[PDB]
Structure formats: structure tokens, C-alpha cells
């Protein structure tokens with residue numbers, strides 16, 4: 001019999017009003033006998049029906065895969081609304097049901113500090129700009145780097161680490177050629193989190 | 208004597224209601240002799256006071272460098288209000304002033320097309336996904352790439368090029384390992400411009 005998996009919107013979709021977040025219900029392992037599959041979507045227990053379901057597609061193990069996609073209102077998701085997908089298909093005895101929702105917990109607003117590179121580090125070819133993001137809950141967060149215009153490639157972020165007061169912190173490290181840092185170029189760490197004003201803050205840093 | 212330069216907001220900052228746009232006034236070639244510099248900000252003729260001046264930072268020239276940022280309203284900038292920085296130094300015969308505004312001109316809407324890699328490029332271990340953005344005005348624009356919610360590394364973008372019909376176009380090229388493309392991953396080019404509905408559009412691309 002089939003399998004269903006239920007995928008949440010990615011955080012930055014929920015946090016920007018410009019972008020458009022979606023919940024995705026996918027069923028796989030549906031037999032060739034009865035390829036037809038019905039989706040029922042509930043938001044907080046009431047049926048909704050603006051979901052786009054796409055045409056079924058056969059995979060190379062000779063079973064179909066079909067996906068149903070529901071656009072969510074940003075505020076609905078951020079207010080902890082439960083999204084439930086219910087799949088019916090003739091091979092199942094009882095229809096099967098998944099539910100997801102934003103991670104629970106009292107939200108906490110992160111502080112965002114930028115740390116210039118250590119002086120022992122500027123004897124080197126590349127240098128590291130550091131962004132400390134601490135005090136935030138829940139752990140859904142986005143951290144990015146920009147420079148006088150366009151995004152930066154060469155950065156890595158730590159996974160959220162549980163701190164001693166129950167909130168998370170993390171660090172983001174951006175490595176730049178030292179000649180760019182020495183020229184007074186400005187680099188910005190932007191953070192997106194549901195607990196910030198406007199879900200967005202930015203801290204700049206330069207020599 | 209002291210030079211004056213005045214930089215506009217970052218396009219992304221003006222197009223997103225959650226980000227926060229600033230006009231920046233930089234003064235360089237500041238002498239030790241008469242070190243104090245006072246700024247005076249004017250929106251559409253009338254004076255303003257919420258500017259933030261960061262204290263002087265001396266350079267390797269032994270010149271000084273003084274900056275003052277003014278936060279602007281998104282709508283004020285998009286509606287063409289003129290921002291004027293007037294700077295006084297007791298080593299200037301007359302205070303010196305500059306003025307910026309959004310690029311004048313009727314706004315045209317960009318068409319966004321995504322172009323897969325050439326069949327000839329599948330010989331290499333990396334391939335180029337292409338994003339063509341054409342028919343837009345003014346040239347203040349932001350292009351970014353992403354995949355499964357996260358910002359995609361590489362990609363470079365051309366400057367806007369004046370088309371024959373009065374508008375601009377640009378291309379953005381993203382380099383992915385060929386295996387990532389052949390697997391079926393979905394990449395997406397997102398674009399931000401005044402003339403787009405919601406100032407934002409996304410176009411996807413995948414094998």
C-alpha cells in the first residue's frame with residue numbers, strides 16, 4: 001500500500017510577505033491497478049480546497065507518485081494552525097492522515113552581533129567575519145550575508161545549539177579575501193526569525 | 208578639499224517592506240586641522256533630523272572619513288522624493304551638497320525566462336543554468352538563485368544592458384555540478400523590481 005509524506009514550508013517563505021509558502025503532501029508506492037488517489041485538506045479541522053494537485057507520474061520502480069500542494073497564509077502558519085492531509089485510495093482499508101504545524105514554544109527575540117576577524121588572522125590570505133545570533137526560540141531561522149548589493153557565496157552557518165537558558169544560539173562565518181576587507185567594503189549579516197520586528201534584522205560590519 | 212559622495216539604498220531594501228533602506232553620505236579627505244563636519248539632510252526641500260552620524264574614523268592616509276546614514280520610507284523612495292545631503296566643514300569656503308533620487312523613467316515590467324544548459328554543455332562536470340530578465344525599467348533590480356529553500360552559491364549576474372527598445376535586460380548564470388542537475392533538483396531564479404506585482408517573482412527550472 002501507499003506511503004504519504006507531509007512537508008512543511010521552508011522558514012524564509014513563512015517569514016517574508018513577498019514570498020509564497022506551501023505545504024506539500026506526496027504519496028508514493030501506489031499500485032498500477034488503482035492509480036487514482038484523493039486528497040482532502042483541513043486547516044485546523046475545517047476542509048479547505050484551494051490545493052493544486054498535479055498529474056500522477058510513474059517512477060522507475062513501476063508505481064506512481066502524486067503530490068498535492070496547498071498555499072498557506074503566512075499568518076495562519078505563524079499562528080500555529082494545524083495543517084492536515086488525508087489521502088484515500090482503493091488499496092488502503094482506511095484513509096491515512098498526516099498533520100504538521102510550526103514548532104511550538106514561546107518565541108524569543110534573537111540579538112545579532114557581528115565580530116570582526118582576530119588580528120592574528122590577518123596575517124593570512126582569507127579572513128573570517130563572524131555573526132553571533134543568540135537568544136532565539138524556536139530554532140527556525142535564516143541567516144545570510146550580503147555585500148554592497150548582492151549575496152555572498154562563501155559562508156557557513158552552525159546548526160542551532162541549545163544554550164543554558166533554553167534558547168538557541170548559532171554562529172555564521174563568512175570568509176572573504178583579505179584585500180576586500182582591507183578596502184573598507186561593508187558586509188552585512190541579515191537574520192530572519194519570527195520573533196524579530198518585521199521578521200528581519202541586519203547588522204553591518206567593515207574595517 | 209573634502210570630497211562628498213552619496214550612495215542610494217540597496218534595491219532589495221527598497222522593494223521589501225520588511226527590509227530597511229538607507230541613503231548614505233560619506234565624506235573623505237577630512238583634515239586633522241578642522242576635523243568637525245556637520246550634516247544637514249533634506250527630503251524634497253524640507254529638513255530632516257533622524258540621520259545617524261558615526262564618529263570620525265581615521266584612515267591610512269591620516270585623512271579622516273565621516274559617514275551619516277538616513278533611513279528613508281520605502282514609498283518615499285519609490286515615489287521619487289529627492290534626498291539631499293549638505294555638509295559643512297570649517298575648511299570649506301561653502302558647504303557642499305549632493306542629491307540623489309530613484310532613477311527617473313516610466314517603469315516597465317521584466318519578463319523572466321529560465322534557460323536550461325546546452326546539450327553541448329553536458330560534456331563538462333559543471334553546467335550553467337541561465338536566467339534571462341528582459342524588458343524592465345528602471346535598472347534598479349535584484350536577482351537571486353535558490354534551491355530547496357536555500358540560497359544557491361555560485362551564480363554571477365551581468366550589469367543591466369540597454370536594449371534597442373529603451374529598456375534593460377540582464378542575464379544571471381548559476382553553475383551547478385552536472386549530477387545535481389541530472390538528478391532532477393529544482394532550481395529557481397527570483398527577481399525583485401518595482402514593476403512586478405508584489406515587487407517579486409520566481410521562476411523555476413529543472414530537468
Ligand SMILES: *[C@@H]1O[C@H](CO[C@@H]2O[C@@H](C)[C@@H](O)[C@@H](O)[C@@H]2O)[C@@H](O[C@@H]2O[C@H](CO)[C@@H](O[C@@H]3O[C@H](CO[C@H]4O[C@H](CO)[C@@H](O)[C@H](O)[C@@H]4O[C@@H]4O[C@H](CO)[C@@H](O)[C@H](O)[C@H]4NC(C)=O)[C@@H](O)[C@H](O[C@H]4O[C@H](CO)[C@@H](O)[C@H](O)[C@@H]4O[C@@H]4O[C@H](CO)[C@@H](O)[C@H](O)[C@H]4NC(C)=O)[C@@H]3O)[C@H](O)[C@H]2NC(C)=O)[C@H](O)[C@H]1NC(C)=O
Nearest residue numbers: 148149183184185186210212214231233235236266268270
Ligand atoms: C584617503 O583614503 C580613502 C580610503 O580609500 C580606501 O583606502 C585606500 C587606501 C584604497 O584602498 C581605496 O581603494 C579605498 O577605498 C580614500 O577615500 C576614497 O576616496 C575616493 C575618491 O576620493 C572614493 O572614490 C569614489 O568611489 C565611489 C564608489 O565608492 C564605493 O565603492 C567602493 C567599492 O569598491 C567602496 O570601497 C566605497 O566605500 C563605496 O562603497 C559604497 O559604500 C556605501 C556606504 O559605505 C554602500 O552603501 C554602497 O553600497 C557602496 N557601494 C559600492 C559600489 O560598493 C564612486 O562612486 C565615486 O565615483 C564618482 O567619482 C569618480 C571620479 O569623478 C567617477 O569615476 C564617477 O563617475 C563618479 O563621478 C561622479 O558621479 C556623480 C554622477 O553619477 C556626480 O555626483 C559627480 O558630479 C561625479 N563627479 C565627481 C567628481 O564627483 C568615486 O570613485 C572612495 O569611495 C573613497 N573610499 C571610501 C571607503 O569611501 C581617499 O580618496 C584617500 N585620500 C587621498 C588618496 O587623497
Ligand SMILES: *[C@@H]1O[C@H](CO[C@@H]2O[C@@H](C)[C@@H](O)[C@@H](O)[C@@H]2O)[C@@H](O[C@@H]2O[C@H](CO)[C@@H](O[C@@H]3O[C@H](CO[C@H]4O[C@H](CO)[C@@H](O)[C@H](O)[C@@H]4O[C@@H]4O[C@H](CO)[C@@H](O)[C@H](O)[C@H]4NC(C)=O)[C@@H](O)[C@H](O[C@H]4O[C@H](CO)[C@@H](O)[C@H](O)[C@@H]4O[C@@H]4O[C@H](CO)[C@@H](O)[C@H](O)[C@H]4NC(C)=O)[C@@H]3O)[C@H](O)[C@H]2NC(C)=O)[C@H](O)[C@H]1NC(C)=O
Nearest residue numbers: 003005007008024026028029059060061062063065355356
Ligand atoms: C519507488 O520509487 C519512489 C521514487 O524514488 C525514485 O525511484 C527509486 C527507485 C529511486 O531510484 C529513487 O532514488 C528515486 O527518486 C520512492 O519514493 C520514495 O519513498 C521514500 C520512502 O519509501 C521517501 O523517503 C522519505 O523521504 C523523506 C524526505 O524526502 C525528501 O528529501 C529527499 C532527498 O533526501 C527527496 O528526494 C524527496 O523528494 C523529499 O524532498 C522534499 O520534497 C518536498 C516536496 O517536494 C520539498 O518541499 C522539500 O524541500 C524536499 N526536502 C528535502 C530534504 O529535499 C523523509 O522525510 C522520510 O523519512 C521518514 O522515514 C524515515 C524512516 O523511518 C525516518 O528516518 C525519518 O525520520 C522519517 O520518519 C518519520 O518522521 C516523522 C517523525 O520523525 C514522522 O512523520 C514519522 O513517525 C516518522 N516515521 C516514518 C516511518 O515515517 C522518508 O524517508 C522518498 O522521499 C520517496 N522519494 C520521492 C522522490 O518521493 C519509493 O519508495 C519507491 N518504492 C519502493 C522502493 O518500494
Ligand SMILES: [Cl-]
Nearest residue numbers: 151152358359
Ligand atoms: Cl549566495
